[PDB]
Every structure is written in C-alpha cells, then in structure tokens.
Write a protein that binds this ligand. Structure first.
Ligand SMILES: Nc1ncnc2c1ncn2[C@@H]1O[C@H](COP(=O)(O)OP(=O)(O)O)[C@@H](O)[C@H]1O
Ligand SMILES: Nc1ncnc2c1ncn2[C@@H]1O[C@H](COP(=O)(O)OP(=O)(O)O)[C@@H](O)[C@H]1O
Ligand SMILES: Nc1ncnc2c1ncn2[C@@H]1O[C@H](COP(=O)(O)OP(=O)(O)O)[C@@H](O)[C@H]1O
Ligand SMILES: Nc1ncnc2c1ncn2[C@@H]1O[C@H](COP(=O)(O)OP(=O)(O)O)[C@@H](O)[C@H]1O
Ligand SMILES: Nc1ncnc2c1ncn2[C@@H]1O[C@H](COP(=O)(O)OP(=O)(O)O)[C@@H](O)[C@H]1O
Ligand SMILES: Nc1ncnc2c1ncn2[C@@H]1O[C@H](COP(=O)(O)OP(=O)(O)O)[C@@H](O)[C@H]1O
Lengths: 304, 304, 304, 304, 304, 304
C-alpha cells in the first residue's frame, strides 16, 4: 500500500530497516513470516506467480494450487482494496506476489537471512555470476549449504541439458513458489534459460521482492558468457536492478566478491570470499566494507 | 478542450501562468483542486489511469475504484462532448487523465507546490536522476519531506527487490491514482521498472500533466546507469520531455542541480542543492537563475 | 477523384494552382469552404479522422460526432463511389479525410491563408522545429496571432507535463477535427507525442491535406532534440514530406527560416523572420526567394 | 498459368516478346486488351487489388466494385482452375491481379505504350526518382502528356499535404484500379507514402505486372531523399525490381536518364532526356542504347 | 520416417546414394516416382504445399486440388502414423511435402535428372545467381531446355513487372505444385519476390527436398544485387543450404560455375559452363571436379 | 521436483553424479529407464514434446500418440502435483518432457552412454559443428555407428534439399520422440533448420535434458557458416548451453575436439579424434583431459 511520512516517522523507518539487516537475529524474519502464513485461513490464496503466458497461478499456505476461489475483497489500511478471484486454475482478479501482508509498515528491508564466516547475508535474490574460470554451480551449492546452517537448503533445477532437469517454465514457477513457501534457503540452478516470455520477465522483476518479503534467500547462477549485448545487457540489468545481493567472480581463481544491498536507501556492503574444491567438485567457502555507486558499475563492467 | 486567443487574451494567459508559479501562494492550486473534486457528485468518475494492457481503471473523488457506471455525456464550453462509461471494472468510454475539468482557462501552468530554502518548486512530475555517486533514493525522500513541509508526504513503492515492495504494474497505477487524489507531495520509489507495456508508456506520457493539473508533485527516481542506448535514450526523453522539473546529480558528491519548467512557453529556472547524510542514511538538504535550451542539453549529456 | 489532362487543361490547372497561392485574396479559400460546409444537409458526415486504434470517428458540419448513420452512397464526377456508414460511434464505411468534396477540379493547391509582414503564408500544415536556443512554443503562438489577424486562433494542447494538458490521443484528434471545422488558424502545442500508433501515423499523413483542402493552417511545434535516428529521422521525414510549410530555427537566436511549398509541382519559397520577447515570454515577429531541393536538404541537416 | 517450351517454341516466344516492344504499333496492346475487357460478360469480376489490410477488392469491366459474386470456377489451358468469389465487398476466393486472361501465350512482354521524340516507351510501371535538384512532379506530368499523345492522361493523387489530395490507401487503390481499367497513360503523384501495410507491399509488387498486362503505363514519382537505409533501400529495390522502366535524374539540372526493360530476358535500353520549364512550372521534354547489369547498379548508387 | 543402421546397412546406403547420382540412368528416378504416384488410389492426397498464411493446400496425383478429404490414418514401416484430413480447401491434418512415400529406404540422394554436354545434373533445386553482367534469366531458360533434352520444360512465372506475370504467392505455389507433379524439368522465373511470409519461408525450406524426392529439377533465378545484409544473407543462406545445386556467374561474362551436391554426406562437384547469345537473347550453353567446403564459401563470398 | 540437501546428502549426490559418468557400466542407465518405461500402465502418457505452434503432442511407452486422455493427477514425493490431460490430439494439461519420473533423486547426471576408442561418451545432446573443411554429416554417422556398438543407431532426417527428407517441423518432433522412446543412439541430420518458432525454441531447450534423463544420446549436426551474428550467436549459445557434449572441427582436416559435460557442477573433459574416409565417403574414427571455462570460450570463438 502507500505509506505517509514526516521527518520523525521517516527516521524511525530507516532505523528499523537498518536494524532488520544489521542487528535482528539472523533468520528471525523468516520465522515471523512462517507464523503469519500458518495462521492464514485454510484455502486462502497466499501467493500468485506468473506462468509463461503472463497469466498467474495461485497457491495456498501449503503450496497447493488453488484452482477455484470466489471473488473476495479486503480493504487495506491505506484505503486500497485487494480483490482475489481464481477460476479454472488461474487468477481472475488479484496481483502477482504475496496475497497476504507479511510486512506491515516494515517495508524496504533486506532481512538478514543468515550469518556465516563473520558476515551477515541478506534474504531476497542473490545472483551468482561473472566471467572467468571460477565455477558458478559449485558456488551456489556451497552458499546454499552455508546459509542453510542447521537447515537443509532446497534446490530448484531448471534448463540444463542434464538428467532429470525440468525445462518447462510453468513447472519451474511451481517449484519456486513451493520452495519459497516452505524453505529459508533456496538454490536455483540456472536462471540462464529464463534470460523472453511474459512470465520470464515477470519472474526476474518479482522474485527479489517475493523472497525479501518472506525473509528467504534465492541463490541463482547466471552465466554472462554470451557476446550478444541484447542478452549480456539483460544479465547486467538483472544483476544490477533485480538482485538484492550479487556474488561475482574475480581475477583470482576461487575468489569471489559479495555486494549486498542492506535496505531501502542504505549503503551496499562488500566483502571477499576464498574457496577451494574437495572431492567430486564439492566446494568449500573458507571462513577465517561500504562501497559507492561508482565501484558498483566497475564490477558490472566485468561481465563484458 | 481547445481555447481561442487574440493578442490581449493571450497576454492575460501568460500573465496568469507566470503568477501560478511565481506569486500564487505555495500549494494553493492543490487546495483549489481539492475543492473542485469535493464538489463532484457522489459516484462520479474523476480520474482514469492506464493499466498494463492499455485499458484504464477509473476512480471517484474518494479514490475508490468504479466498477460500473452507465454512459453519461457532458458537453464542455468549447463544444466538445465527454462521454464516460465504466463496465466490469474498466473504462468502456472516456479518456485517460482527469475526467472532470480542474483547470478551466488556466492551462499550461506549473502551479507552485511548495517553497523550501528560499526556492519555489513546481507541482507536476520531478525526475531525480544522473550518474555518479550521489544516491537518488535518499534524495527523493528528503525532497518529499521538504516540500511536504507541514504535511506528510505519500510514498508509492514499486519494483525493487526489497521487502514489501509491490512489483505488479496494475497495483502500481492504483497506488499512484489514490496518491494524487489525496496528497500534495508524492514520492515514487522506482520508476526504473516502468522504463515497455502500453500501460507503462501511457504512464510516462500522462503522469506529469495529471499532477500539474491537480497541483500535486510526484518525485520519482530514475537510474540512467544502463549502457543500452535504447533505454538510456528513453531515460533522457523522459527527463527532457515528460518531466515538469529535473533534479540531477553533479561531479561533486552531495550536490544537485534543479531545472524547473515554470510554465507553457516560459523560461526554465536552475538552482543548486547541497546535501548531507545523518544517521541511517537520512539525507538533509541544506538551506542557507534562468537557463537556455543549450544548457539543458548539456545537462542531459550527463546521462551517457 | 482522378482527373484527366492534355497540354491545354494541364496548363490551366497550373495557372490556377499558382494563383491560389500567389494572387487570390488571403484567406478567401477558407471562406469558400465554410460556405460549402454550411450548405451541407444536416446530419451529413463531413469529416473522418483516425483514432489511436486506426479506426475513425466522424463529424458533421457543426463539429459534433455522428454515432449512427445508415449506409449512403454518392457517385462522383469521375465515376468513383463514396459510401459512408457510421455505427456505434465508428466509421463502418468511408475514408479518412473530408467526406464532402471541398475542392472539385481545383486540387494540388496551397491556398494562401494569410499575409503578414509582407509575406503570404500557405494553409495546410506548418511544422515549427529546429535545434538550438530559439523557443518553439513562443513562436507558434506568435505565428498563430499574426496569421489570425482580425480572427482569434484556436489552440489544441497535447502531451506536455503542464496543467490541463490532455495526453490522450483520441481526445486530441477530436480537438483537431473541431478546430479545423471551425477556425482558419490553429496552433498545436506538441506534435512531439505523436512522433507509433496506427492513428498517429494516420494523423501525420492526413493533416496537411485536410487543412490545405479546408484552407486553414495548422501550426505545430516539434522538438528534434533526441539522438535516436529512429525518431530524429521521423522528424525530418515529417518536416520534409508531411508539411506544407516548414519554420526552422537558425544559428542566430531569435531568427527563423520559413520554407513554403506553394503548390503541386511548384517551387518552394523561403524568407527569414526576426523576433524578440516582451513581458511573460510573449514573442513578437518583426515586420519591416525561390529555393532548390539542395537548399531544402541542407536545412533538414540542421535537425541532427 | 505454366507454359511448356522446347528450343523451337522458346525462340518463337522471344521473337514475339522482342516484337511486342520493338515493332508492334505503339499502344496496340492497350487497344487489344480494351477489346478483351469490353467483351466480358457484364458483372464478371475482371480485376482484384489489395486494400490496406491485405484483403482484396474487386472490379468489373466498368470499374465498378463488385460486392457480391457467387463462387465460379474456370479451368485454364494448363489444367489449373481459377475460382472467384466475392462476399460483403471483398474477395473470398481468387487472386490479386487480372481475373480474366488478357495475354494468353504472350507473356513476359513490355508492350510498347507510345513513341515520342524518336523513342519507344514501355507500358508497365515507370518510377521517376533520383537525388538532386531536377523536379520529379513536373517530369511525371510532362511524360504523362507526351506519352498520352492524342489522348489525355489520368492523374491519381495520393499522400501529399496539398488541397484535395486523398491520403486514405483504400481510396487510392480504387482510383488506381479505375485508372488502369480506363486509360492508357496514368500518373501517380506520390508513391512516397506507400513506401509498410500488407496492401502497400502488395501494391509495389503487383502494379508493374498489372499495367504491363493491360498495355498501359503508370508513371510514379518517388523521392529517395531520406537517409534511412531501411527506406532508401526499399526505394532502390522498388526501382530495381518492381519497375518496368526507370527515369532518374542526373548531375546536370534538367537532364534525365531513361532505363527501359524491353521484355523477359531481354536487354535494358537507355537514352537521355533534356527538359526545360515554361510558365507556372509546366515542364517540356525536348525532342530533337543497350546497357549492362553493371551500368544499372551504377545508376542505383545515385540514390544514396 | 526414421531409419536404423549398423556399419553394413550404412555402407549399402552410401553405395546406393552414390549410384543414384553417378550411375543410374539420367531421369530414371523421375520415371520411377511417376509410377508410384500413378498407383495411388484415386482422390488420395499426394502433395501438400504452404500458402502465404502458412496453411497448406493439397493435390491429388493428377494435380487437382482436394477441397475435402475425411480423416485417414496410415501407419508407416517405422511405426509413425500419417493422418491426412482436408477441410474447406485446406489441410486440417497432415504435413507439408509428399503425402505418399516416394523414396522408401532410398533417401539422402540427389537423383540424376539429366546429362548434358558430358556432365550429370542433379534433380532437386538449382539456384542461378551471382553478381556481374552475365544475365540469369537467359541462363535458366537455356538450362531448362538443355536438361529437358527430349522433353519440354515447364516455366513458372512469378513477380516480375512484365505482361501476364502472376504476382500472387498463392497462385504461385499452386503452379509449382502442379509443375512438380507433372514435369521433370521446371524453371521458376523469379524467386526474387519470395525472398517474408510463413508461406515464403516454408517454400525455401521445402522445395529442394520436394523436387529431389520426385526426381525433378527446379531451376530458379535469384539476384543477390541488393546491399541489404538482411536480404543478401538470406540469398547466401538459400544458395548455401536450401539448394541442391548452385550455378553462379564469374568474372568472365558468359562463364558460369556449377556446384553440385551429389548426395547425403557426399562430396560436391564443380564444373564450368561457357555460353553465348543468339538472336533475341536466346542463350546457348556450349558443349565440347570435387571441391571442399572452403572453396564453397569462397564462391558464396561473390554475392556481397 | 525440488530436492533438499545438507552437507552430507549433497556430498553423496555429487559422488553419485560423478559415478553415473565415470564408473557406471556404459549404457546401463538406458537399460534402467527402458525398464521403468515398460512397467508403465498401458495407455499412460510418458512423453510430451512441443510442436511448431508451441502446443505439445503426447506419446505412450510404445511411441504411439495419445489423442485423448482424461485428466489424471499424481502427487510427487516433494509435494508437487502433475496433472496430465490430452484432448483432440494435444496436451491440455501437463508439461513438456518426461511425464513419468525416470530419475527420482538421481538428477544432474550425464549418464555414460557408451565407451569407444578408450573414451567414455555422455548421453544427452551432442552438437557436431565447427567451420572449416571437415564434414559434419560423415562424422555424425560415424559417431552414431561407433556409440551404437552392438546396436543399430536411429537416423532422424530433417531440412536438407535431398530425396526423402522431411522438412515439416511437426513430423520432425514426432520422429525425435519415437527415436528417444526406442533407441539409445540417435543421429539428427540437420538441426540447421530449427536454428524461430515456439516449438523450435522449446526443442533446443528441452532435448538435451530429455535425452540425458533417458540415457540415450542425440548426435546432431549444425553448420555455423552464416555470417549473421543473430544466427551465428544462436549456434554458439546452443553449443554452449543446450548441449551436453560438443564435437567441433579444428585447424587440421579430419581432426575433431570433443568437450564433454560430465555432470552437474562437475568439470568438462576434452579429447581429440582423428578420422579418415573410405569408399563412398564412409568415415572411420581412429582408435588407438579436464578443461576450464576459458578453454571452452576459446573453442566457441572458432564459430565466427
Ligand atoms: N575440481 C574442480 N577444480 C577446478 N574447477 C572445477 C572443479 N570442479 C568443478 N569445477 C568448475 O565448476 C564449474 C562447473 O559447473 P558448471 O555449471 O558446469 O559451470 P559454470 O557454473 O562455470 O557455468 C565449471 O566452471 C568447472 O570447470
Ligand atoms: N551514509 C551514506 N553515505 C554516502 N552514501 C550513502 C549513504 N547512505 C546511502 N548512500 C547512497 O544512497 C543510495 C542508496 O539508495 P539506492 O536506491 O540503493 O541507490 P540509488 O538511489 O543511488 O540508485 C546509494 O547510492 C548509496 O550508496
Ligand atoms: N524571455 C525569454 N527570453 C529568451 N528565451 C525565452 C524567453 N521566454 C521563453 N524563452 C524560451 O522559449 C521556450 C519555451 O517554450 P518551451 O516549450 O518550453 O521550449 P521549446 O519550444 O524551445 O521546446 C524555451 O526554449 C525558453 O527558453
Ligand atoms: N520554374 C522552375 N524552375 C526550376 N525548378 C522548378 C521550377 N518549377 C518547379 N521546379 C522544381 O520542381 C519540383 C516541384 O515538385 P515537388 O513535388 O514539389 O518536388 P519534387 O518532385 O522534386 O519532389 C521541385 O524540385 C521544384 O524546385
Ligand atoms: N544479347 C545479349 N547480350 C548480352 N547480354 C544480354 C543479351 N540479352 C540479354 N542479356 C542479359 O540477360 C539479362 C536479362 O534478363 P533479366 O531478367 O532482365 O536480368 P537478370 O537475369 O541479369 O536479372 C540481363 O542481365 C541482360 O543484360
Ligand atoms: N571422400 C571425401 N574426402 C574428403 N571429404 C569428403 C569426402 N566425402 C565427403 N566429404 C565431405 O563431407 C561433407 C559432406 O556432408 P555435407 O552435409 O554435405 O557437408 P557438411 O557436413 O560439412 O556441412 C562435405 O563437407 C564433404 O566435402
């Protein structure tokens, strides 16, 4: 909805956003939203995501698709009215994204999803990319394991010519929706094929906000390697504007840079990661700050 | 509608437009239009805005959507007839923009919306952009608070991968419409995703006139950073032609230049802003003239 | 319709076209067509103009839309048949342009619309453009007033982020149709937003001929400034091929060049205008010749 | 239809084609086809031409549109079957072009349409173009008069911002169809606006063959001036491949080059024209050979 | 259908393909397929070809169009089922190409169509092209007569601005289909206009295989002359990949090079032709080897 | 479906993927999936593949199309539900790819398809390409025979101007579906014509995964030669991202490099092949390793 501010309430908002990343207990936001979702009336639509055509499918708190749901209006705090209607498996009225309020007045945050090796990581969408030899797939799985911590991470597989990989975009959004409804740490192996259908465009523009609202993190690999400035520029835009965090390889094999947006209007942070391979390509991230817009575009230059 | 002029009535018009910016009390046009809107019969359509598909949704004076409205024709002073009809939630007959006359013969103005730090600011649309390190988001919120003055400003959030952010264009135009119907100072955090669907194109072409007619100001951030001349040129076109005022960053961090169109056929004004950060990135605009077309393009060059 | 000629009838035709511009009384053609229009039976469709979709709306002699009109055929002198039919507010049968013959055998003329400062000006469409510091909006209004003479000029406002400006293309063509049905001098402030929908394309290709047939002049501003050779070339093409006359700014501020197509197969003329500003940006054109295609292309080069 | 040949019948065909241009009496082919058309059963569809949408309208021998005509099959010599059906004003079954056989076994000809100043001119389509100062409109009218000889020439006017010019493509094909059904020499003032809708594409690809089959000549002006290689290349292709003859200006003002295709597989001929202006821009062509493909492209280079 | 091979059956296949070009009697495959076609039940669909829209028209063995044919399924040797159904003149079920099997296990051949001047020529499609002065039209007709030998050749005419030329694509594919059903040597005068609608794209991709399967040869001229890399590259792609053989002009007027694909996986052959003109442009090919991929691209370079 | 992992389960997974390529018996996965497929209830849909329009056709375990199948839902281990429904020959509900689970928890593998000349080859899709003189068609057939071993390989022929080649995309995907349902080694001679319809796009993105899931190998030729960076880049992208393995010609005639993706997150391998021709162009691959991303891009450079 829309929110109104004066100097006092605005400074309070920035303090709360700053805290959502810097001082809240890691993963606390996810626990909170899990609670909100479980308290939802059974059968109530909670999430809508776009399919290939641009239409939207809808899920309930248990990640089950809602094929029929009669028009139901709810008036928001600001006066706006939300209408949700599902017919023949598709959204007749409503919008893409969360259909129930998980945030309230606390918007514009990058809720801390986990802490690892002395660094806080943000929920939302993390794009792992870059040119060079450092492998992306091995890195997204290591990050998944590390941010997972005590919890297992969920893996969504899409669009790679390997066994058992789904390549149908509509099955893909279903897997993603289920993952975000049920897990805090999610890995997507290959955003490459979404990079375009209406649904694919909606996905790139919606996923970061969906994840950040839930307090979960979606870690996705994206190979820039493609000298087609129509696509390479989309890679740079996806990484620049649709990602909450960016993990990009460097000049040194095994080394990566993490650039994190800490919240609305706040500074991006940066830190370096050292990694090494064990058996069967299992990668390990070794354990034992603020950057400006200029530095950011310098990094984006890497993908050309 | 159309208007007829001879030398005398044209000179009176330019004098009135000059005064709407330079001498009228700041914010007075907004108070004036609020009264016009409140005198509208209950249930009467007053504003129509384009949704993604190019269709339009319609609202009444209280910012409630009209789903059904039987054909009604009104003849204007110039002889033009306006027919409005709403069916199944969408405008069947009518046009985008204000459906009731808010201006009469007083057209082509940039009604002063507020005065801050010794400078007058125009209503209409203000695009905050430029390249460099100066952050745009902190600046749009500082301007919102500053021009808000004694009133709170409204914040419309769209298309950022952060918590609670709507990413659905149709929810976005609903928020924008309600905001212009009810508030004098509005901030849009991220015009980046509109920059294209029929709806998005309609929005860039319509918003400035809609706001200037209401006497409200809409402050939107737009990042030029994207070396794709297809998009970078659309940013410059939006900044050059669809904006009532332009706020652009300079070579000096923290410093900004404000270029203001004062009215139809009138000269653009320019002044500079110095700013600084407090805690949690809250920016403050420090407190304690005419330019030509050449200078303007010089400034536009900056976004390349 | 089609016309047949031999050497004798062709020479008489060129003499008549030459006279329509060089010696007829200024504005006499407009008075003649006004008589033709008023002698039309009531309810008879006289003008059709394309809306955004490419469909067309129809007006009677009093500039009122015709929503229903049963099929009616008329045979012309050349044997062609014109069938007009309007259903549900849109043309079902007919063509864009004048639905009643305003010209007969006298076609291919640029009927003199007015005389000012010792120069004859042609009716039809006049595009005011150019790069540089010289302001286009103040010039179109000064030309409107000057060619208006004893008559007031009509102003059609479209697509500028200023108060009361319509930004809906369909309201725009309704405004234009009414202006041409009722006034000899018309100003359009901003052809910029038409420069593309089917309707916008129809408008650029139809307006000059509609106005020249009527004997009225449409003075429209168009800013070339936009380094996108897709658009900048559309500005050059419209100025080259869709304009009866072109008014373009020069190297010297305040100075403009007027290039006039005097008639079918006849030579283009050229003259210069000096101007200055008074209070509130009111511009005054100071008072007290054949060119070749080469010269024309040189002038067009200016818009790059 | 398809035709079968052995060496003997092929040499006979080339002899007959060669004769159709070089030795037949000028204009004899047109007289012959006029006879064939007048002998046609009344109400029988004889010509179909594409409108803007790509649909086709149909005319009878008297240039009157056929709105309804029930399915009717005719078996051709080669075994192919022609079906013609018109419903609600449009062609339901059939093809664009002549719906009755005007040629027989004599195909691939450029029937001599007239002789003037010691030169034979071909029927079909003549495109008058080129860069430089020599005016095209004055030249197409002089050629029209000269090839007309004892007969008047017909003028189709389309897409110029001058009085009485039709700008509706569907009215334009009707005028063209009527002209070809009833006159031997036709002038089209401005192919510029057709240069794209389905109908416009059909027109460029159909007109030359339609005219050559009828034995009439269609003289059309086409200004290349437009530095948009998307359009300029279409001008060159239209002139190279859709024209039976080409008349292009040269380095010397008033001088033109005529390149004529004399028939299927035959050599293109070339000759020069000297011209001068009299009063009111009436141009006169003064009165008192084989070229290779290379020379042809040299000339095409001129339009860049 | 699909075919299964081991080393032995594959070696037999290559031996049979080698013989279909090098040792079978010239024209024998065409005689063979004529018998297969004549053994087809009356009224049975045997060939389907795409019309402009992408739909397909269907013919029986006597080259008569089938307007209605009830669903009929046939199971092939490999297990694939072919279902054919024609409704209202268009294929409702089926595929483009031959609807009856003309080849069995003998696939991937370039069946020798004729022998002339000591050289064997392949059936399938032959593109005659190149830059320079050597005329293509005279050459396609000389090859037609020469390969025709004791039989007349069929000429399909399309898209030239000359008398009696069809310019309607749908009439064109009807002529082509009837020609391949009834004649061994076919000349197409002007593939220039197909070079794009779904139908045109289907034609370039289908014609070569259709002809090579029938054992007939289709000789088509294609002018590369058009400096529009969009089109010039399509010409080279057509010459490189959609042609069974290529006949291209050289630096020496009258001289041509013939590049022949002899079969699936086999080497391309090359030989040279000397030619001369007699009366009325009738060309005669004078009478009295392997190349690599490199040489081939060298030749393709010529068309730029 | 989606899968959950912790450090322990992830390491077990990588060990299993590593083994599926490096140590499992060659061709064992194909035998396993053949068993899964044969144990499927009769009439059950097992594979869906997209046709030209983007719609999909469905096959049962015996490679016979299913034209009608009433809605039927199945719940997977992860909670996702698969609903399959076929109506009028097309999939009404379901997804492209395998409709029955052939993999379970073992996904992301490149199951070894065969061993030849001391090298293991992966199932999935293999693209044979490169510029130069080395022939692709003779190589795909030699690879087919060699990987076939004791089994015959299946050949799918598409889009070449040779006898018996199908050129209809819908017959093509039917051929491919049947080949993968019944054979371990499949050759596709000419992916060139798919390189675009929705179906063609679906095919490039689906085939590798379909084949790898089955344990069969699809060996497809693709000629890069075409200087149209729109297409040449599509060849590089397909070879880079849609291929399980790549076989590319080198500087030395007869020599090829094989780059193999061994599994999800695992290293690519590389080895060289020497070849020679026997009679009738039958090629023989002579008998008697990890690379980095840099090396891969270097090889891709070759196709420019
Ligand atoms: N043991 C290893 N040593 C070095 N590099 C490895 C090792 N194992 C895997 N890699 C690299 O990890 C990446 C594998 O994941 P893959 O999806 O195939 O590539 P990418 O993520 O780089 O697009 C490759 O770049 C591969 O070369
Ligand atoms: N305390 C600070 N000091 C300097 N820069 C800051 C500070 N806080 C925020 N910023 C800048 O404000 C901007 C944050 O808003 P954001 O929307 O992410 O970026 P932007 O508006 O520049 O596109 C960033 O450019 C950030 O670097
Ligand atoms: N008093 C003045 N002196 C000089 N220039 C002026 C004056 N008043 C207005 N102008 C110029 O007139 C133009 C105003 O009309 P506007 O539509 O905004 O610009 P433009 O027509 O050049 O696109 C501007 O270019 C402005 O700088
Ligand atoms: N008396 C004349 N002397 C020299 N040139 C003339 C004369 N009359 C007309 N012209 C030229 O004839 C052409 C007029 O026809 P028009 O349609 O306006 O131009 P064009 O055919 O060159 O596109 C112009 O180029 C014009 O300058
Ligand atoms: N007698 C001849 N001597 C030299 N060239 C000729 C002769 N007759 C015809 N030609 C050439 O044959 C070709 C005629 O066929 P056409 O279709 O117009 O051209 P093209 O095949 O080259 O595109 C032309 O190139 C023409 O110059
Ligand atoms: N005996 C041979 N010696 C050398 N090269 C051969 C031999 N036989 C066939 N070839 C080559 O094999 C290829 C034939 O298959 P084709 O599909 O036409 O070509 P490609 O696969 O290279 O596109 C050609 O490049 C041809 O020159």
């Amino acid at each position: 909805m829309i929110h109104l501010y004066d100097a006092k309430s605005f400074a309070k908002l920035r303090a709360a956003q700053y805290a959502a990343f810097h001082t809240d207990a890691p993963g606390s936001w996810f626990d909170h939203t899990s609670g909100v979702l479980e308290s939802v009336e059974d059968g109530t639509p909670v999430l809508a995501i776009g399919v290939e055509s641009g239409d939207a499918i809808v899920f309930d708190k248990n990640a089950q698709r809602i094929v029929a749901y009669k028009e139901k209006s709810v008036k928001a705090e600001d006066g706006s009215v939300s209408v949700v209607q599902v017919e023949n498996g598709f959204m007749k009225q409503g919008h893409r994204g969360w259909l129930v309020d998980l945030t309230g007045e606390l918007v514009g945050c990058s809720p801390v999803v986990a802490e690892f090796g002395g660094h806080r990581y943000a929920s939302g969408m993390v794009i792992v990319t870059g040119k060079g030899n450092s492998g992306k797939t091995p890195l997204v799985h290591a990050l998944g394991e590390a941010l997972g911590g005590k919890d297992k991470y969920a893996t969504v597989r899409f669009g790679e010519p390997l066994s058992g990989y789904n390549t149908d975009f509509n099955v893909f959004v279903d897997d993603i929706a289920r993952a975000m409804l049920q897990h805090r740490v999610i890995v997507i192996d290959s955003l490459k094929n979404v990079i375009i259908s209406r649904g694919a465009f909606d996905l790139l523009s919606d996923i970061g906000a969906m994840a950040a609202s839930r307090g979960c993190v979606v870690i996705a690999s994206l190979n820039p390697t493609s000298n087609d400035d129509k696509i390479v520029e989309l890679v740079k835009e996806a990484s620049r504007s649709n990602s909450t965090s960016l993990v990009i390889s460097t000049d040194v094999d095994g080394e990566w840079q993490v650039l994190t947006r800490t919240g609305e209007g706040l500074q991006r942070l940066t830190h370096t990661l050292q990694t090494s391979y064990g058996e069967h390509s299992v990668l390990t991230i070794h354990t034992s700050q603020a950057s400006g817009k200029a530095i950011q575009t310098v990094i984006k230059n890497d993908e050309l």
